[PDB]
C-alpha cells in the first residue's frame, strides 16, 4: 500500500500558447470523489499567491517556495505577469488546483504587439475560451479582485456561462477580495457587498450563494444572520505585515494567518458534485479535459461572438 | 462647486478671465473619500469638498480663481457612489427589463462622457490600481465612430457662437491631451519612475494599435505627449482612511509632485502656446483657443441641451450581448419547433430548447415556440 508519488512544485496543463500538454497522468490515481479548483482574475491580484496557500505553503514560507510562481520585483517595477497559461498540482487529500492566465492583462498584448482581426479581440477570446472551459470541469471557481466592484468582471461571466458547449451544469463560484482594508471589514460595508453581487448577477445561473458564510466562520463573532438579506458566497482577504508601549497598532482586521487557515477549511470542505453524467475517476477527468478543450476552441458560440466585435 | 445644470443658468465678477478646464472621469472604489474628490482638495490647496456631507450619472464643477482653471467630474455607474443607488433601488423596485437598465446608463455615460471630449483641453481619468483596464480600448475606439455621427449636429447648436472658427469645425477648443492617475494600492512602496515609463510603454502601443492614435492630432479625439510626464501613481498615505490615523496618534500621546505634474500641463494652455502632439512621419498644425468663463457657458450650455443624439445612440458592452443572445435563440427556434396530452409532448420540445441555447433575451423569444405550437393543435 506504497504511496503513488508527491508533488513540490506544479507542472504546466496548457501550454502559453493554447496547447494541451499531456505530462500529468504520471501524477493521478484510478479512485473517484475528487475536488477542482479552478481561478479567474486581473494581473496582479493574488490568484497565484492564494491557490498555493491553500494547496501546500502556509505564511511562514517564503515566495521562493510557492509551487505556483507568484510575481517578482523585477516584473513590477516593469508591469507583467507571470503565469503564463494554466498551472496543475495535486495536494496530500488528492484536491486539484488550476491557476490561470490573466484575464484583461495588457502584458499579454503588449507581448502580442511584437509577434485573425485585431490582437485586443484575439485576447478578448482567450478568456472566455479559457473560462467556459473551467466553468465545465470545475467545481469551484476563485474569481479574485484587488479593488471593489469592478463591472466589467461582472459583466464578462455571464457572457462565459453562455459560450460553453452545453439538468446543465453550472458550478460554484466565490467573490475574494484580496488586499482588503480596515473599512472592508466594518458590517455596516460588509452589507453593501452582498447586496451589489446579489443585484448584478441575479440572473447569472452561477451557484454563488447559500454557501461559504464567513458570517459563520467566527469572524465577526457578534453578528446574526438575520443581518443580511442575501448572504452570497464571499470571502475577503487582507494585507499581509513595559508591555503597554510594547502594544500592537490597531490593525482593525483578522490576520492574514487566521483567515488563510479558515478559507483553506472551507474550500476543503466544498461539495464535489458529478460534472458529466458518468462517475469519473482523477484519471477520465483529465481525458474529458482534453475533450472539452478540442471542443472550445474549433466551435460555433466562439467564432459567432468573435465576428460581433 | 454646485451642479452644471445650476451652473449653465447664467458670471459678472469673473466674466472675462482667461481660463482652462479639467474633465475628470474614470471608475472608483467604494469608500468614503472619493479618488475624485481628494484629488481636487489636493491642488487647489483648500478644502473645496468637504469631507462627511432614473439616472444615475451626473457632473459638478468648480471654479479656482487663485489658479484660473475650471474641473469636471463626471460621476457615472463605474464608481461605487452611485452604483449602491442603483442595486439599492432595484432590489425594492425581471431579467429583461434589467438588460435595459444595465445598459441604458451604460449609454448614459457614453454620451456624457462625449460631451467632456469636446469642450475640455484637458483630461485625467483614474483607475483604483495599475494595469489600466484594457475595456478602454473599445470604449474609445467605439465612441469616436459616435461622435463623427453626431459631429454634424453639434457643429449647429454653436454656429451663433463667438467662440471662434476651428471651435465650429471641430466643435472642441483643441485636440484633449489625456492623462492617467494608478493608485498604488499596497504595491511595491527610483521603483515607481520605472512603474511610470512602462505604463506608457503600454499604453501608447495599446492604443496605437488600434488606431486611435494616429499621426494626425486633429482626427485623434485625444493626445499623448512626446518629452513629458503623461503618468502620475498615487502612493499610499494615512490621509485615506481617517479612523486609522487618530489611532496611530493616539498611541504616540500617550507614550515629481501631483501639482508640478498637472500644472506643467495647464502652463501650456494658459501661455497659449497649445499642444503640438503630432509625430507620425510628418508634422501638422493643431489649432487651439484659450476661452473665456462667459465665452466657454455660450457653447457649453447651447450643447448640454442637446432626439436628436438619440438617433446615433441607440444605433451607435450590452449591445453586443444582445445580438448573440438574439442569434443563439432565434437559431434554437427552428431546430426546436421543426423537430417537434399535448401538453406533456410539447413540454418535451421545450426540454431541447434549454440545451440548445440561451441568452439575454432567451425568454422573450421562447414565446414564438410556444405560440407557434399552441396554434398547430
Ligand atoms: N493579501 C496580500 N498581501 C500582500 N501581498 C499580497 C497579497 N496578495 C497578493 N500579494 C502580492 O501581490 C503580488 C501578486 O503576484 P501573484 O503571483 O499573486 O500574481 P498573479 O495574480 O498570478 O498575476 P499574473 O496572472 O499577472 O501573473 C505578489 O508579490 C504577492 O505576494
Ligand atoms: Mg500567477
Given at each position: 500500500?506504497?504511496?503513488?508519488?508527491?508533488?513540490?512544485?506544479?507542472?504546466k496543463?496548457?501550454?502559453?500558447?493554447?496547447?494541451?500538454?499531456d505530462?500529468a497522468?504520471?501524477?493521478?490515481?484510478?479512485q473517484?470523489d475528487?475536488?477542482?479548483?479552478?481561478?479567474?482574475?486581473?494581473?496582479?491580484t493574488?490568484?497565484s499567491?492564494?491557490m498555493s496557500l491553500?494547496?501546500?505553503?502556509?505564511?511562514?514560507?517564503?515566495?521562493?517556495?510557492?509551487?505556483?510562481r507568484?510575481?517578482?520585483?523585477?516584473?513590477k517595477?516593469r508591469?507583467?505577469?507571470?503565469?503564463?497559461?494554466?498551472?496543475?498540482?495535486?495536494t496530500?487529500?488528492?484536491?486539484?488546483?488550476?491557476?490561470?492566465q490573466?484575464?484583461?492583462?495588457?502584458?499579454?498584448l503588449?507581448?502580442?504587439?511584437?509577434?485573425?482581426?485585431?490582437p485586443h479581440?484575439?485576447?478578448?477570446?482567450?478568456?472566455?475560451?479559457?473560462?467556459?472551459?473551467?466553468?465545465?470541469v470545475?467545481?469551484?471557481?476563485?474569481?479574485?479582485?484587488?479593488?471593489?466592484?469592478?463591472?466589467?468582471?461582472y459583466?464578462?461571466?455571464?457572457?462565459?456561462?453562455?459560450?460553453?458547449?452545453?439538468?446543465?451544469?453550472?458550478?460554484?463560484?466565490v467573490?475574494?477580495?484580496?488586499?482588503?482594508?480596515?473599512?472592508?471589514?466594518?458590517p455596516?460595508?460588509?452589507?453593501?457587498?452582498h447586496?451589489m453581487?446579489?443585484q448584478l448577477?441575479?440572473?447569472?445561473?452561477?451557484?454563488?450563494?447559500?454557501?461559504?458564510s464567513?458570517?459563520?466562520?467566527?469572524?465577526?463573532?457578534?453578528?446574526?444572520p438575520?443581518?443580511?438579506?442575501?448572504?452570497v458566497?464571499?470571502?475577503?482577504?487582507?494585507?499581509?505585515?513595559?508591555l503597554f508601549?510594547?502594544?500592537?497598532?490597531?490593525?482593525?482586521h483578522?490576520?492574514?494567518?487566521?483567515?488563510?487557515?479558515?478559507?483553506?477549511?472551507?474550500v476543503?470542505?466544498?461539495?464535489?458534485?458529478?460534472?458529466?453524467?458518468?462517475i469519473?475517476?482523477?484519471?477520465?477527468?483529465?481525458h474529458?479535459?482534453?475533450?472539452?478543450?478540442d471542443?472550445?476552441?474549433?466551435?460555433?458560440?466562439?467564432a459567432?461572438?468573435?465576428?460581433?466585435? | 462647486?454646485?451642479?452644471?445644470?445650476?451652473?449653465?443658468?447664467?458670471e459678472?465678477?469673473?466674466?472675462?478671465?482667461?481660463?482652462?478646464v479639467?474633465?475628470?472621469?474614470?471608475?472608483?472604489?467604494?469608500?468614503?473619500?472619493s479618488?475624485?474628490?481628494?484629488?481636487?482638495?489636493?491642488?487647489?490647496?483648500?478644502?473645496?469638498?468637504?469631507?462627511?456631507?432614473?439616472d444615475?450619472?451626473?457632473?459638478?464643477?468648480?471654479?479656482?480663481?487663485?489658479?484660473k482653471?475650471?474641473?469636471?467630474?463626471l460621476?457615472?455607474?463605474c464608481?461605487n457612489?452611485?452604483?449602491l443607488?442603483?442595486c439599492?433601488?432595484?432590489?425594492s423596485?425581471?431579467?429583461a427589463?434589467?438588460?435595459?437598465?444595465?445598459?441604458?446608463?451604460?449609454?448614459?455615460?457614453?454620451?456624457s462622457?462625449?460631451?467632456l471630449?469636446?469642450?475640455?483641453?484637458?483630461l485625467?481619468?483614474?483607475?483604483?490600481?495599475?494595469?489600466?483596464?484594457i475595456?478602454y480600448?473599445?470604449?474609445?475606439?467605439?465612441?469616436?465612430?459616435?461622435?463623427?455621427?453626431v459631429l454634424?449636429?453639434?457643429?449647429?447648436?454653436?454656429?451663433?457662437?463667438?467662440?471662434?472658427?476651428?471651435?465650429?469645425?471641430?466643435?472642441?477648443?483643441?485636440?484633449?491631451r489625456?492623462?492617467?492617475?494608478?493608485?498604488?494600492?499596497?504595491?511595491?512602496?527610483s521603483?515607481?519612475?520605472?512603474?511610470?515609463?512602462?505604463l506608457?510603454?503600454?499604453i501608447?502601443?495599446?492604443?496605437r494599435?488600434?488606431?486611435?492614435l494616429?499621426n494626425?492630432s486633429?482626427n485623434c479625439?485625444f493626445?499623448v505627449?512626446?518629452?513629458?510626464?503623461?503618468?502620475?501613481?498615487?502612493?499610499?498615505?494615512?490621509?485615506?482612511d481617517?479612523?486609522?490615523?487618530?489611532?496611530?496618534?493616539?498611541?504616540?500621546?500617550?507614550?515629481f509632485?501631483?501639482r508640478?505634474?498637472?500644472?506643467?500641463?495647464?502652463?501650456?494652455?494658459?501661455?497659449?502656446?497649445?499642444?503640438?502632439?503630432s509625430?507620425?512621419?510628418?508634422?501638422?498644425?493643431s489649432?487651439?483657443?484659450?476661452?473665456?468663463?462667459?465665452?466657454?457657458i455660450?457653447?457649453?450650455?447651447?450643447?448640454?441641451?442637446?432626439?436628436?443624439?438619440?438617433?446615433?445612440?441607440?444605433?451607435?458592452?450590452?449591445?453586443?450581448?444582445?445580438?448573440f443572445?438574439?442569434?443563439?435563440?432565434?437559431?434554437?427556434?427552428?431546430?426546436?419547433?421543426?423537430?417537434?396530452?399535448?401538453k406533456?409532448?410539447?413540454?418535451?420540445?421545450?426540454?431541447?430548447?434549454?440545451?440548445?441555447?440561451?441568452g439575454?433575451?432567451?425568454?422573450?423569444?421562447?414565446?414564438?415556440?410556444?405560440?407557434?405550437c399552441?396554434?398547430?393543435?
Open positions: 500500500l506504497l504511496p503513488p508519488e508527491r508533488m513540490k512544485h506544479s507542472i496543463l496548457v501550454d502559453d500558447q493554447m496547447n494541451w500538454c505530462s497522468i504520471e501524477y493521478l490515481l484510478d473517484t475528487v475536488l477542482v479548483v479552478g481561478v479567474l482574475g486581473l494581473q496582479g493574488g490568484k499567491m492564494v491553500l494547496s501546500a505553503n502556509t505564511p511562514e514560507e517564503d515566495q521562493r517556495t510557492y509551487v505556483f507568484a510575481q517578482s520585483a523585477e516584473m517595477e508591469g507583467g505577469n507571470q503565469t503564463s497559461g494554466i498551472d496543475f498540482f495535486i496530500q487529500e488528492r484536491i486539484v488546483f488550476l491557476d490561470t490573466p484575464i484583461l492583462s495588457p502584458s499579454i503588449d507581448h502580442l504587439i511584437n509577434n485573425y482581426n485585431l479581440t484575439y485576447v478578448e477570446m482567450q478568456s472566455l475560451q479559457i473560462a467556459a472551459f473551467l466553468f465545465t470545475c467545481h469551484v471557481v476563485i474569481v479574485v479582485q484587488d479593488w471593489f466592484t469592478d463591472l466589467s468582471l459583466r464578462f461571466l455571464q457572457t462565459a456561462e453562455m459560450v460553453k458547449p452545453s439538468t446543465e451544469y453550472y458550478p460554484h463560484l467573490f475574494l477580495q484580496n488586499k482588503a482594508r480596515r473599512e472592508d471589514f466594518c455596516r460595508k460588509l452589507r453593501q457587498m447586496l453581487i446579489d448577477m441575479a440572473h447569472s445561473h452561477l451557484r454563488y450563494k447559500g454557501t461559504l464567513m458570517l459563520q466562520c467566527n469572524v465577526f463573532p457578534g453578528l446574526p438575520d443581518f443580511l438579506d442575501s448572504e458566497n464571499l470571502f475577503l482577504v487582507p494585507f499581509m505585515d513595559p508601549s510594547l502594544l500592537p497598532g490597531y490593525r482593525g483578522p490576520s492574514f494567518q487566521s483567515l488563510v487557515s479558515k478559507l483553506r477549511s472551507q476543503m470542505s466544498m461539495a464535489r458534485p458529478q460534472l458529466s453524467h458518468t469519473l475517476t482523477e484519471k477520465n477527468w483529465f474529458y479535459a482534453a475533450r472539452i478543450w471542443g472550445v476552441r474549433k466551435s460555433s458560440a466562439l459567432e461572438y468573435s465576428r460581433l466585435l | 462647486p454646485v451642479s452644471l445644470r445650476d451652473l449653465l443658468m447664467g459678472p465678477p469673473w466674466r472675462e478671465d482667461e481660463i482652462c479639467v474633465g475628470i472621469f474614470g471608475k472608483t472604489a467604494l469608500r468614503l473619500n479618488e475624485k474628490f481628494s484629488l481636487v482638495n489636493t491642488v487647489c490647496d483648500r478644502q473645496v469638498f468637504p469631507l462627511f456631507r432614473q444615475y450619472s451626473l457632473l459638478q464643477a468648480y471654479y479656482s480663481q487663485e489658479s482653471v475650471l474641473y469636471l467630474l460621476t457615472s455607474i464608481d457612489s452611485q452604483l443607488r442603483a439599492r433601488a432595484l432590489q423596485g425581471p431579467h427589463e434589467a438588460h435595459e437598465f444595465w445598459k441604458h446608463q451604460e449609454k448614459l455615460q457614453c454620451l462622457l462625449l460631451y471630449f469636446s469642450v475640455c483641453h484637458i485625467l481619468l483614474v483607475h483604483p490600481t495599475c494595469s489600466f483596464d475595456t480600448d473599445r470604449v474609445f475606439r467605439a465612441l469616436d465612430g459616435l461622435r463623427q455621427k454634424p449636429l453639434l457643429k449647429t447648436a454653436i454656429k451663433d457662437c463667438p467662440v471662434g472658427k476651428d471651435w465650429k469645425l471641430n466643435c472642441r477648443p483643441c485636440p484633449p489625456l492623462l492617467f492617475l494608478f493608485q498604488l494600492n499596497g504595491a511595491l512602496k521603483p515607481k519612475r520605472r512603474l511610470q515609463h512602462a506608457e510603454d503600454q501608447y502601443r495599446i492604443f494599435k488600434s488606431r486611435v494616429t494626425q486633429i479625439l493626445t505627449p512626446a518629452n513629458q510626464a503623461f503618468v502620475y501613481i498615487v502612493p499610499g498615505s494615512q490621509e485615506e481617517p479612523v486609522g490615523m487618530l489611532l496611530d496618534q493616539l498611541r504616540s500621546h500617550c507614550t509632485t501631483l508640478e505634474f498637472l500644472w506643467q500641463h495647464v502652463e501650456l494652455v494658459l501661455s497659449k502656446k497649445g499642444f503640438d502632439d509625430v507620425g512621419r510628418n508634422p501638422q498644425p489649432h487651439f483657443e484659450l476661452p473665456t468663463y462667459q465665452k466657454w455660450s457653447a457649453a450650455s447651447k450643447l448640454y441641451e442637446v432626439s436628436k443624439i438619440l438617433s446615433s445612440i441607440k444605433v451607435l458592452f450590452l449591445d453586443i450581448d444582445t445580438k443572445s438574439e442569434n443563439r435563440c432565434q437559431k434554437a427556434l427552428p431546430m426546436a419547433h421543426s423537430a417537434y396530452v399535448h406533456n409532448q410539447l413540454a418535451q420540445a421545450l426540454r431541447v430548447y434549454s440545451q440548445h441555447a440561451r439575454p433575451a432567451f425568454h422573450k423569444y421562447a414565446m414564438q415556440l410556444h405560440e407557434d399552441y396554434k398547430f393543435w
